[PDB]
Amino acid sequence: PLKVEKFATANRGNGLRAVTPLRPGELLFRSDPLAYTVCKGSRGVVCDRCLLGKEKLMRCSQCRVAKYCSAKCQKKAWPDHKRECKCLKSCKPRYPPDSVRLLGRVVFKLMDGAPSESEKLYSFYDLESNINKLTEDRKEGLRQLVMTFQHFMREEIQDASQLPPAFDLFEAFAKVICNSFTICNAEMQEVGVGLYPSISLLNHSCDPNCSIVFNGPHLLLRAVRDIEVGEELTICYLDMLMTSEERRKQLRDQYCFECDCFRCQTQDKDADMLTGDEQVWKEVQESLKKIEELKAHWKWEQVLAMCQAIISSNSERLPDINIYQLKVLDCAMDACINLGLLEEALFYGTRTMEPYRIFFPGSHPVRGVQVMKVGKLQLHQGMFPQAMKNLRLAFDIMRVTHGREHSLIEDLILLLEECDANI
Ligand SMILES: *c1c2c(nc3cc(C(=O)N4CCN(C(=O)OCC)CC4)ccc13)CCCC2
Ligand SMILES: C[S@@+](CC[C@H](N)C(=O)[O-])C[C@H]1O[C@@H](n2cnc3c(N)ncnc32)[C@H](O)[C@@H]1O
Ligand SMILES: [Zn+2]
Ligand SMILES: [Zn+2]
Ligand SMILES: [Zn+2]
């Protein structure tokens, strides 16, 4: 028996609403993807199927683009990979955009796979396309994505007979733009992209009552507030460290709607997000583009050096509540944790603690993971009372955002038990 249901909203198309009263932390829906693929920057860094990062990966001898954590992952991914493997091969060294590879797996799964559990509440055919709202610029880009698809899928798709019935490629890419899910690993690293059509019923809110968390490619939908019967479920489409101006631009360009929630009407937290000298954080925001680019390709040393040049700069610095300063603090923490610089990592991680409490209110999985990382760094350095306080606070957040069903909760309990034995 399902706790959620599809329904027609008054001005937001279709949505999800509660069949029953929901409490914080209650699991609402699990789903594998209908189709998914590894991101461009994580390809060869994480297993193509399970999206876990490893020292070494074994590669597909046929294409050599697909790489895996183990022999089980390579053999199990073969059915969903066999048709794409050789549009991939015989197109080297020309790797297609992530969206084109994503749609290729959608077509193969819809053509050759059985009815997907991921389409139980909502199918790929039902997905919103927002076609009558697309600008001519966005249409032009979708036509370039269509011809890119046809060129990449030459060897396996000759004609409309090998596409689903009434399947239009322009509209399919329109659905991908506004229904794609970025997949983040346990450490909140962007590792993949996938489609979850039943989950794609959730409308956006800048202050949601639900949350998404990923266990590999598997998705868990949870309540993070109290929700009463008939109340619509919402998730935040966007990073929390965005101003209302940046949220307006992204919700327009990608999702074709104007948000008039309370937070956007009052520019909630905008001023605190941009404290400090404007010229200083405009450079940091400009430099974050390359910093985040290097992080997407797991080049941690380059991330740290650029972040150190900002955090320990000889020129004027920013307060830690400035979102662009905060992002540099986060990138530097992840770079240090992963180069083994654990005292420098804790220095940056502890600094993000108070800004994260303000910008991730209630129960947000991003804060719970950040707090868990800080508590894990404190425990590894013998700061047992300080570590316990954060590890418990991480459990108070992540037990609502992450599940009994999420593997990271098991890892947190071990750290809690270990820290408890020490105390
Ligand atoms: C990766 C990372 C961060 N947060 C994430 C949040 C989610 C998220 O729950 N999600 C984004 C995709 N989305 C959507 O586009 O709705 C319209 C279809 C649903 C909501 C995904 C991945 C995330 C935090 C920083 C670390 C990376
Ligand atoms: C992932 S789909 C959500 C389900 C969608 N309403 C449907 O019927 O399939 C995202 C699309 O829903 C609409 N939408 C989502 N959140 C909205 C909101 N808060 N206000 C207005 N429209 C919204 C936008 O058109 C967006 O392109
Ligand atoms: Zn694997
Ligand atoms: Zn292959
Ligand atoms: Zn809003």
Tab-separated table of C-alpha atoms and ligand atoms in Angstrom:
chain	number	residue	atom	x	y	z
A	1	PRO	CA	0.000	0.000	0.000
A	2	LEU	CA	1.409	3.346	-1.134
A	3	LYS	CA	1.615	6.413	1.101
A	4	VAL	CA	1.684	8.791	-1.900
A	5	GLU	CA	-0.471	9.320	-4.977
A	6	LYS	CA	-0.375	11.125	-8.301
A	7	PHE	CA	-2.800	14.025	-8.633
A	8	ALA	CA	-3.488	17.068	-10.795
A	9	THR	CA	-2.377	20.290	-9.135
A	10	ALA	CA	-4.169	23.586	-9.689
A	11	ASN	CA	-1.330	25.363	-11.522
A	12	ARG	CA	1.747	23.069	-11.492
A	13	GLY	CA	0.695	20.193	-13.731
A	14	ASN	CA	0.862	16.823	-12.008
A	15	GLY	CA	2.280	16.215	-8.549
A	16	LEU	CA	2.516	13.870	-5.582
A	17	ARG	CA	0.419	14.153	-2.425
A	18	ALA	CA	0.074	12.180	0.789
A	19	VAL	CA	-2.493	9.386	1.038
A	20	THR	CA	-1.766	9.272	4.773
A	21	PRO	CA	-0.210	11.437	7.511
A	22	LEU	CA	3.574	11.432	7.198
A	23	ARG	CA	6.189	12.084	9.871
A	24	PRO	CA	9.812	13.235	9.486
A	25	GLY	CA	12.008	10.379	8.302
A	26	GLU	CA	9.235	8.171	6.919
A	27	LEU	CA	10.226	6.391	3.717
A	28	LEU	CA	7.822	7.346	0.925
A	29	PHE	CA	9.177	5.617	-2.196
A	30	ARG	CA	12.176	3.627	-3.402
A	31	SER	CA	13.175	3.424	-7.053
A	32	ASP	CA	15.919	2.181	-9.299
A	33	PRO	CA	16.440	4.381	-12.371
A	34	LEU	CA	14.669	3.764	-15.634
A	35	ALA	CA	18.039	4.653	-17.177
A	36	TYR	CA	21.225	6.211	-15.842
A	37	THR	CA	24.857	6.801	-16.738
A	38	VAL	CA	28.046	8.043	-15.109
A	39	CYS	CA	28.839	11.743	-15.425
A	40	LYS	CA	31.565	12.946	-17.785
A	41	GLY	CA	33.950	13.874	-14.972
A	42	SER	CA	33.435	10.646	-13.008
A	43	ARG	CA	33.784	8.263	-15.967
A	44	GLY	CA	36.632	5.897	-15.211
A	45	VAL	CA	36.611	7.060	-11.585
A	46	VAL	CA	33.468	5.248	-10.410
A	47	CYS	CA	32.026	1.919	-11.493
A	48	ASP	CA	29.673	2.408	-14.424
A	49	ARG	CA	26.890	0.413	-12.725
A	50	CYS	CA	27.194	0.836	-8.960
A	51	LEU	CA	28.742	4.343	-9.129
A	52	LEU	CA	31.249	3.531	-6.364
A	53	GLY	CA	34.738	5.048	-6.627
A	54	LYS	CA	37.789	2.791	-6.597
A	55	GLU	CA	41.541	2.623	-7.061
A	56	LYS	CA	41.382	0.699	-10.328
A	57	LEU	CA	38.571	-0.201	-12.705
A	58	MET	CA	38.324	-2.982	-15.256
A	59	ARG	CA	37.196	-1.650	-18.623
A	60	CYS	CA	34.887	-3.015	-21.300
A	61	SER	CA	37.263	-4.674	-23.759
A	62	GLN	CA	34.820	-3.928	-26.594
A	63	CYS	CA	34.370	-0.169	-26.167
A	64	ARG	CA	36.884	0.683	-23.385
A	65	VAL	CA	34.638	3.595	-22.369
A	66	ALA	CA	32.687	1.612	-19.748
A	67	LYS	CA	34.573	0.721	-16.554
A	68	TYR	CA	33.508	-1.148	-13.449
A	69	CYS	CA	34.204	-1.900	-9.793
A	70	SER	CA	34.336	-5.686	-10.246
A	71	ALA	CA	33.498	-8.552	-12.586
A	72	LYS	CA	29.962	-8.822	-11.194
A	73	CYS	CA	29.272	-5.167	-12.011
A	74	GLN	CA	30.637	-5.535	-15.551
A	75	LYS	CA	28.659	-8.711	-16.253
A	76	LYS	CA	25.450	-7.387	-14.681
A	77	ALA	CA	25.655	-4.072	-16.555
A	78	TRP	CA	26.074	-5.875	-19.897
A	79	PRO	CA	22.341	-6.190	-20.808
A	80	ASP	CA	21.751	-2.443	-20.375
A	81	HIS	CA	25.126	-1.761	-22.047
A	82	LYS	CA	25.277	-4.134	-25.034
A	83	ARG	CA	23.457	-1.869	-27.501
A	84	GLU	CA	25.176	1.320	-26.312
A	85	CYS	CA	28.597	-0.362	-26.099
A	86	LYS	CA	29.215	-0.095	-29.839
A	87	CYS	CA	27.681	3.244	-30.634
A	88	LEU	CA	30.281	4.128	-27.991
A	89	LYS	CA	32.881	2.036	-29.812
A	90	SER	CA	33.145	3.034	-33.497
A	91	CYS	CA	32.788	6.683	-32.487
A	92	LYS	CA	36.021	7.080	-30.546
A	93	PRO	CA	37.424	9.378	-29.392
A	94	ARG	CA	34.142	11.298	-29.633
A	95	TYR	CA	32.216	10.851	-26.389
A	96	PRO	CA	28.651	12.239	-26.514
A	97	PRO	CA	27.055	14.573	-23.955
A	98	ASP	CA	25.638	12.958	-20.831
A	99	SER	CA	22.061	13.669	-21.931
A	100	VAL	CA	22.522	11.880	-25.264
A	101	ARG	CA	23.974	8.794	-23.566
A	102	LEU	CA	21.138	8.963	-21.029
A	103	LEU	CA	18.444	9.013	-23.721
A	104	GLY	CA	20.170	6.167	-25.557
A	105	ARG	CA	19.698	3.957	-22.505
A	106	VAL	CA	16.091	5.146	-22.181
A	107	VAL	CA	15.397	3.960	-25.730
A	108	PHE	CA	17.094	0.583	-25.253
A	109	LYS	CA	15.310	-0.030	-21.945
A	110	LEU	CA	11.919	0.948	-23.377
A	111	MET	CA	12.515	-1.200	-26.470
A	112	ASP	CA	14.051	-4.343	-24.948
A	113	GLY	CA	13.507	-4.213	-21.184
A	114	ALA	CA	10.445	-5.370	-19.301
A	115	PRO	CA	7.991	-2.981	-17.609
A	116	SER	CA	10.130	-0.898	-15.263
A	117	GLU	CA	9.273	-0.526	-11.581
A	118	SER	CA	10.500	3.076	-11.880
A	119	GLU	CA	7.483	3.960	-14.065
A	120	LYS	CA	4.838	2.686	-11.631
A	121	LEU	CA	3.342	6.089	-10.752
A	122	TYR	CA	4.491	7.954	-13.866
A	123	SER	CA	6.048	6.793	-17.126
A	124	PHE	CA	8.576	8.375	-19.460
A	125	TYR	CA	5.685	8.929	-21.878
A	126	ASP	CA	3.885	10.997	-19.218
A	127	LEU	CA	6.842	13.257	-18.386
A	128	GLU	CA	6.396	17.001	-18.755
A	129	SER	CA	8.126	18.472	-21.805
A	130	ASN	CA	7.302	22.191	-21.312
A	131	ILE	CA	7.504	22.473	-25.100
A	132	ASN	CA	5.152	25.464	-25.471
A	133	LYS	CA	7.346	27.375	-22.992
A	134	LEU	CA	10.765	26.738	-24.564
A	135	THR	CA	12.584	29.721	-26.020
A	136	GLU	CA	13.849	29.643	-29.593
A	137	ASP	CA	17.369	29.437	-28.153
A	138	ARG	CA	16.467	26.337	-26.130
A	139	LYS	CA	14.714	24.801	-29.147
A	140	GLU	CA	17.857	25.307	-31.245
A	141	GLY	CA	19.920	23.512	-28.610
A	142	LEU	CA	17.448	20.629	-28.502
A	143	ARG	CA	17.716	20.239	-32.282
A	144	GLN	CA	21.500	20.025	-31.930
A	145	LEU	CA	20.986	17.365	-29.253
A	146	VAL	CA	18.661	15.483	-31.618
A	147	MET	CA	21.204	15.373	-34.447
A	148	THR	CA	23.892	14.476	-31.902
A	149	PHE	CA	21.726	11.552	-30.774
A	150	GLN	CA	21.096	10.315	-34.323
A	151	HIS	CA	24.821	10.455	-35.108
A	152	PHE	CA	25.844	8.686	-31.898
A	153	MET	CA	23.126	6.014	-32.210
A	154	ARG	CA	23.852	5.354	-35.914
A	155	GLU	CA	24.798	1.692	-35.544
A	156	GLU	CA	21.810	0.602	-33.421
A	157	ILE	CA	18.968	2.932	-34.506
A	158	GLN	CA	18.464	3.221	-38.267
A	159	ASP	CA	14.824	4.241	-38.345
A	160	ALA	CA	11.703	4.984	-36.303
A	161	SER	CA	10.960	1.238	-36.227
A	162	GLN	CA	13.723	0.839	-33.620
A	163	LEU	CA	12.255	3.661	-31.532
A	164	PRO	CA	9.182	3.251	-29.304
A	165	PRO	CA	5.835	4.052	-30.955
A	166	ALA	CA	5.045	7.754	-31.407
A	167	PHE	CA	8.495	8.442	-29.923
A	168	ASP	CA	9.755	11.913	-30.874
A	169	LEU	CA	13.396	12.727	-30.156
A	170	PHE	CA	12.960	16.497	-29.778
A	171	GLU	CA	10.251	15.996	-27.153
A	172	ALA	CA	12.269	13.235	-25.465
A	173	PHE	CA	15.187	15.613	-24.906
A	174	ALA	CA	12.727	18.237	-23.656
A	175	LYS	CA	11.609	15.711	-21.031
A	176	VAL	CA	15.227	14.945	-20.103
A	177	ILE	CA	16.037	18.612	-19.443
A	178	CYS	CA	13.331	19.123	-16.806
A	179	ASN	CA	13.169	15.614	-15.295
A	180	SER	CA	16.826	14.564	-14.987
A	181	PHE	CA	18.178	13.668	-11.548
A	182	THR	CA	21.791	14.377	-10.716
A	183	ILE	CA	23.087	11.370	-8.769
A	184	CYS	CA	25.366	12.049	-5.799
A	185	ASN	CA	27.288	9.388	-3.885
A	186	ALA	CA	27.371	8.908	-0.110
A	187	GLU	CA	29.984	11.671	0.273
A	188	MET	CA	27.748	14.009	-1.778
A	189	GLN	CA	29.968	13.877	-4.859
A	190	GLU	CA	28.163	14.297	-8.181
A	191	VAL	CA	28.760	10.925	-9.832
A	192	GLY	CA	25.932	10.244	-12.289
A	193	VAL	CA	22.680	11.239	-13.951
A	194	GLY	CA	19.465	9.266	-14.272
A	195	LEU	CA	15.721	9.317	-14.823
A	196	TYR	CA	13.175	8.326	-12.163
A	197	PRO	CA	9.795	9.009	-13.794
A	198	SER	CA	7.660	8.178	-10.747
A	199	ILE	CA	9.878	10.466	-8.660
A	200	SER	CA	9.589	13.086	-11.431
A	201	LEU	CA	6.063	13.826	-10.168
A	202	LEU	CA	7.512	15.831	-7.267
A	203	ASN	CA	7.176	19.571	-7.816
A	204	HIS	CA	9.808	22.018	-6.598
A	205	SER	CA	9.855	24.137	-3.457
A	206	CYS	CA	12.619	26.338	-2.074
A	207	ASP	CA	11.582	25.016	1.362
A	208	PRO	CA	10.582	21.407	0.693
A	209	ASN	CA	8.788	18.926	2.921
A	210	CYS	CA	10.581	15.907	1.403
A	211	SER	CA	14.110	14.960	0.402
A	212	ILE	CA	15.955	12.685	-2.020
A	213	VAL	CA	19.002	10.617	-1.076
A	214	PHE	CA	20.977	8.204	-3.243
A	215	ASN	CA	22.408	4.777	-2.389
A	216	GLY	CA	24.385	4.184	-5.548
A	217	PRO	CA	21.853	4.581	-8.355
A	218	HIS	CA	19.022	3.588	-5.994
A	219	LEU	CA	16.868	6.485	-4.791
A	220	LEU	CA	15.020	6.926	-1.488
A	221	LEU	CA	12.289	9.541	-1.017
A	222	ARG	CA	11.688	10.621	2.579
A	223	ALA	CA	9.567	13.086	4.492
A	224	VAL	CA	11.577	15.750	6.322
A	225	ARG	CA	8.549	17.611	7.723
A	226	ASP	CA	5.182	16.595	9.059
A	227	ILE	CA	2.803	16.131	6.121
A	228	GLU	CA	-0.968	15.784	6.441
A	229	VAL	CA	-3.400	13.963	4.168
A	230	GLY	CA	-3.837	15.689	0.818
A	231	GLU	CA	-0.763	17.894	1.252
A	232	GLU	CA	1.478	18.001	-1.806
A	233	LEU	CA	4.960	16.516	-1.540
A	234	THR	CA	7.831	18.782	-2.584
A	235	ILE	CA	11.589	18.521	-3.054
A	236	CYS	CA	14.108	21.265	-3.763
A	237	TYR	CA	15.441	20.972	-7.314
A	238	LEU	CA	18.419	23.211	-6.574
A	239	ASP	CA	21.516	23.577	-4.445
A	240	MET	CA	20.647	25.299	-1.173
A	241	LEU	CA	23.603	27.707	-1.510
A	242	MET	CA	21.919	29.874	-4.138
A	243	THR	CA	20.421	33.338	-3.988
A	244	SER	CA	16.848	33.924	-5.109
A	245	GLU	CA	18.256	35.589	-8.234
A	246	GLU	CA	20.266	32.473	-9.122
A	247	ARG	CA	17.264	30.267	-8.332
A	248	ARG	CA	15.024	32.356	-10.603
A	249	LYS	CA	17.436	32.046	-13.533
A	250	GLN	CA	17.825	28.279	-13.150
A	251	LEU	CA	14.121	27.553	-12.639
A	252	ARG	CA	13.414	29.607	-15.772
A	253	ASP	CA	16.146	28.204	-18.019
A	254	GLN	CA	15.754	24.524	-17.102
A	255	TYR	CA	12.235	24.059	-15.690
A	256	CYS	CA	10.202	26.892	-17.298
A	257	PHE	CA	8.354	28.242	-14.271
A	258	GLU	CA	8.457	31.245	-11.961
A	259	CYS	CA	8.568	30.423	-8.251
A	260	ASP	CA	6.518	32.660	-5.953
A	261	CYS	CA	7.132	30.824	-2.686
A	262	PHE	CA	7.694	32.915	0.433
A	263	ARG	CA	11.478	32.603	0.159
A	264	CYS	CA	11.627	33.999	-3.383
A	265	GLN	CA	9.178	36.825	-2.636
A	266	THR	CA	11.229	38.074	0.335
A	267	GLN	CA	14.712	37.191	-1.005
A	268	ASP	CA	15.059	35.001	2.082
A	269	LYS	CA	18.705	34.815	3.259
A	270	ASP	CA	19.966	36.605	0.110
A	271	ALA	CA	21.699	39.376	2.068
A	272	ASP	CA	23.537	37.042	4.455
A	273	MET	CA	24.623	34.884	1.499
A	274	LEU	CA	26.424	37.870	-0.083
A	275	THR	CA	28.063	39.583	2.885
A	276	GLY	CA	31.586	40.888	2.387
A	277	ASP	CA	33.049	42.965	-0.409
A	278	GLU	CA	31.205	42.444	-3.696
A	279	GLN	CA	34.337	42.633	-5.851
A	280	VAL	CA	35.992	39.939	-3.724
A	281	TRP	CA	33.210	37.356	-3.944
A	282	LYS	CA	32.641	38.097	-7.634
A	283	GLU	CA	36.181	36.839	-8.259
A	284	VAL	CA	35.670	33.857	-5.939
A	285	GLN	CA	32.433	33.064	-7.779
A	286	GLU	CA	34.266	33.333	-11.108
A	287	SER	CA	37.128	31.166	-9.835
A	288	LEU	CA	34.720	28.575	-8.397
A	289	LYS	CA	33.808	27.585	-11.968
A	290	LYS	CA	37.279	26.132	-12.514
A	291	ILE	CA	37.497	24.874	-8.917
A	292	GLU	CA	34.214	22.990	-9.292
A	293	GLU	CA	35.311	21.788	-12.736
A	294	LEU	CA	38.478	20.285	-11.248
A	295	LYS	CA	36.420	18.714	-8.454
A	296	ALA	CA	34.060	17.124	-10.990
A	297	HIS	CA	37.126	15.343	-12.420
A	298	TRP	CA	38.408	14.400	-8.933
A	299	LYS	CA	41.645	16.402	-9.350
A	300	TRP	CA	41.887	17.084	-5.639
A	301	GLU	CA	45.367	18.643	-5.526
A	302	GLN	CA	44.436	21.336	-8.047
A	303	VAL	CA	41.233	21.967	-6.078
A	304	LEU	CA	43.154	22.432	-2.825
A	305	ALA	CA	45.796	24.770	-4.266
A	306	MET	CA	43.181	27.078	-5.792
A	307	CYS	CA	41.075	26.953	-2.619
A	308	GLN	CA	44.089	27.737	-0.420
A	309	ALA	CA	44.877	30.773	-2.583
A	310	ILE	CA	41.416	32.092	-1.654
A	311	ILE	CA	41.046	30.927	1.951
A	312	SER	CA	44.577	32.022	2.931
A	313	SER	CA	44.734	34.915	0.464
A	314	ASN	CA	47.025	37.901	0.906
A	315	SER	CA	44.248	40.144	-0.431
A	316	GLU	CA	40.886	40.934	1.153
A	317	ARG	CA	38.974	37.879	2.380
A	318	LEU	CA	35.296	36.981	2.776
A	319	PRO	CA	33.240	35.850	5.781
A	320	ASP	CA	32.439	32.153	5.981
A	321	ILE	CA	28.690	32.780	5.542
A	322	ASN	CA	29.304	34.114	2.036
A	323	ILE	CA	28.059	31.231	-0.102
A	324	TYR	CA	30.988	31.404	-2.527
A	325	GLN	CA	33.426	31.473	0.384
A	326	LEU	CA	31.450	28.589	1.898
A	327	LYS	CA	31.728	26.559	-1.315
A	328	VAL	CA	35.498	27.107	-1.420
A	329	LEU	CA	35.623	26.009	2.225
A	330	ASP	CA	33.722	22.842	1.309
A	331	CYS	CA	35.858	22.043	-1.746
A	332	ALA	CA	39.023	22.543	0.309
A	333	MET	CA	37.694	20.222	3.023
A	334	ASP	CA	36.920	17.436	0.546
A	335	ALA	CA	40.321	17.905	-1.096
A	336	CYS	CA	42.127	17.632	2.247
A	337	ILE	CA	40.156	14.617	3.548
A	338	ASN	CA	41.089	12.853	0.319
A	339	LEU	CA	44.771	13.829	0.143
A	340	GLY	CA	45.086	12.687	3.761
A	341	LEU	CA	45.394	16.227	5.173
A	342	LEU	CA	43.015	15.592	8.050
A	343	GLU	CA	43.881	18.465	10.398
A	344	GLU	CA	43.620	20.959	7.538
A	345	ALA	CA	40.381	19.240	6.501
A	346	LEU	CA	38.913	19.591	9.988
A	347	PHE	CA	39.946	23.258	10.049
A	348	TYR	CA	37.835	23.955	6.960
A	349	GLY	CA	35.060	21.531	7.901
A	350	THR	CA	34.565	23.016	11.357
A	351	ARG	CA	34.327	26.481	9.773
A	352	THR	CA	31.420	25.403	7.544
A	353	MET	CA	29.474	24.126	10.571
A	354	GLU	CA	27.647	27.323	11.524
A	355	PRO	CA	26.888	28.536	7.960
A	356	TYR	CA	25.563	25.056	7.134
A	357	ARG	CA	23.220	25.188	10.136
A	358	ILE	CA	21.764	28.432	8.768
A	359	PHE	CA	21.522	27.567	5.061
A	360	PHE	CA	20.319	23.946	5.493
A	361	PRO	CA	17.444	24.375	7.964
A	362	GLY	CA	15.587	21.446	9.445
A	363	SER	CA	16.763	18.084	8.110
A	364	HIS	CA	18.797	18.258	4.898
A	365	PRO	CA	20.986	15.327	3.766
A	366	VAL	CA	23.795	17.665	2.693
A	367	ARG	CA	24.197	19.041	6.216
A	368	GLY	CA	23.941	15.617	7.854
A	369	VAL	CA	26.771	14.319	5.673
A	370	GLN	CA	28.876	17.430	6.326
A	371	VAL	CA	28.354	17.061	10.078
A	372	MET	CA	29.199	13.353	9.835
A	373	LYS	CA	32.452	14.163	8.021
A	374	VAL	CA	33.428	16.696	10.695
A	375	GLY	CA	32.593	14.271	13.498
A	376	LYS	CA	34.582	11.571	11.714
A	377	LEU	CA	37.595	13.892	11.477
A	378	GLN	CA	37.300	14.798	15.167
A	379	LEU	CA	37.000	11.148	16.227
A	380	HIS	CA	40.066	10.122	14.204
A	381	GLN	CA	42.031	12.815	16.094
A	382	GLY	CA	40.932	11.877	19.621
A	383	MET	CA	38.519	14.793	20.180
A	384	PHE	CA	35.980	12.365	21.592
A	385	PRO	CA	33.472	14.710	23.332
A	386	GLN	CA	33.482	17.054	20.339
A	387	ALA	CA	33.163	14.122	17.927
A	388	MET	CA	30.259	12.534	19.816
A	389	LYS	CA	28.266	15.775	19.788
A	390	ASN	CA	28.554	16.041	15.999
A	391	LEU	CA	28.116	12.311	15.343
A	392	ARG	CA	24.861	12.381	17.321
A	393	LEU	CA	23.747	15.559	15.544
A	394	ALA	CA	24.560	13.841	12.250
A	395	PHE	CA	22.395	10.931	13.396
A	396	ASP	CA	19.598	13.330	14.353
A	397	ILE	CA	19.635	14.748	10.816
A	398	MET	CA	20.517	11.680	8.765
A	399	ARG	CA	18.039	9.361	10.493
A	400	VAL	CA	15.344	11.579	8.945
A	401	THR	CA	17.074	12.254	5.602
A	402	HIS	CA	18.902	8.936	5.184
A	403	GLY	CA	17.183	5.687	5.958
A	404	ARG	CA	17.400	2.471	7.818
A	405	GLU	CA	17.532	1.613	4.111
A	406	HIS	CA	20.606	3.812	3.458
A	407	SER	CA	23.992	2.157	3.963
A	408	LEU	CA	25.654	5.324	5.295
A	409	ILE	CA	23.472	5.126	8.418
A	410	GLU	CA	25.201	1.838	9.252
A	411	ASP	CA	28.574	3.573	8.888
A	412	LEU	CA	27.444	6.353	11.232
A	413	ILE	CA	26.299	3.898	13.916
A	414	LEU	CA	29.756	2.302	13.910
A	415	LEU	CA	31.407	5.695	14.414
A	416	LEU	CA	28.897	6.447	17.180
A	417	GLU	CA	29.546	3.115	18.905
A	418	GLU	CA	33.317	3.505	18.512
A	419	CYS	CA	33.265	7.049	19.896
A	420	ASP	CA	31.053	5.830	22.752
A	421	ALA	CA	33.518	3.094	23.705
A	422	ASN	CA	36.295	5.702	23.772
A	423	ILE	CA	34.295	7.946	26.108
B	1	LIG	C1	23.818	16.108	-5.511
B	1	LIG	C2	24.453	16.917	-4.585
B	1	LIG	C3	23.703	17.775	-3.785
B	1	LIG	N1	22.370	17.719	-3.741
B	1	LIG	C4	21.718	16.916	-4.584
B	1	LIG	C5	20.327	16.890	-4.571
B	1	LIG	C6	19.577	15.997	-5.329
B	1	LIG	C7	18.234	16.346	-5.254
B	1	LIG	O1	17.615	15.884	-4.291
B	1	LIG	N2	17.544	16.544	-6.387
B	1	LIG	C8	18.177	17.182	-7.567
B	1	LIG	C9	17.581	16.707	-8.874
B	1	LIG	N3	16.141	17.045	-8.858
B	1	LIG	C10	15.486	17.466	-9.945
B	1	LIG	O2	16.132	17.896	-10.901
B	1	LIG	O3	14.157	17.749	-9.856
B	1	LIG	C11	13.597	18.067	-11.137
B	1	LIG	C12	13.530	16.777	-11.972
B	1	LIG	C13	15.458	16.440	-7.692
B	1	LIG	C14	16.114	16.929	-6.399
B	1	LIG	C15	20.318	15.386	-6.337
B	1	LIG	C16	21.703	15.324	-6.338
B	1	LIG	C17	22.426	16.123	-5.479
B	1	LIG	C18	24.392	18.472	-2.843
B	1	LIG	C19	25.868	18.921	-3.016
B	1	LIG	C20	26.541	17.553	-3.218
B	1	LIG	C21	25.812	17.064	-4.541
B	2	LIG	C1	10.020	17.140	-12.374
B	2	LIG	S1	8.571	17.887	-13.156
B	2	LIG	C2	7.389	17.897	-11.783
B	2	LIG	C3	6.046	17.296	-12.181
B	2	LIG	C4	5.308	18.076	-13.263
B	2	LIG	N1	4.449	19.090	-12.661
B	2	LIG	C5	4.513	17.125	-14.153
B	2	LIG	O1	3.306	17.289	-14.333
B	2	LIG	O2	5.059	16.175	-14.717
B	2	LIG	C6	9.102	19.616	-13.186
B	2	LIG	C7	8.135	20.533	-13.918
B	2	LIG	O3	7.000	20.788	-13.109
B	2	LIG	C8	6.712	22.173	-13.070
B	2	LIG	N2	6.940	22.652	-11.696
B	2	LIG	C9	7.679	22.001	-10.744
B	2	LIG	N3	7.668	22.738	-9.613
B	2	LIG	C10	6.942	23.856	-9.829
B	2	LIG	C11	6.623	24.932	-9.011
B	2	LIG	N4	7.066	24.975	-7.758
B	2	LIG	N5	5.846	25.955	-9.511
B	2	LIG	C12	5.395	25.905	-10.816
B	2	LIG	N6	5.714	24.828	-11.619
B	2	LIG	C13	6.475	23.816	-11.136
B	2	LIG	C14	7.661	22.871	-14.021
B	2	LIG	O4	6.991	23.068	-15.241
B	2	LIG	C15	8.777	21.877	-14.228
B	2	LIG	O5	9.246	21.919	-15.555
B	3	ZN	ZN	30.640	-1.681	-9.365
B	4	ZN	ZN	31.299	-1.749	-23.897
B	5	ZN	ZN	11.001	29.766	-4.331
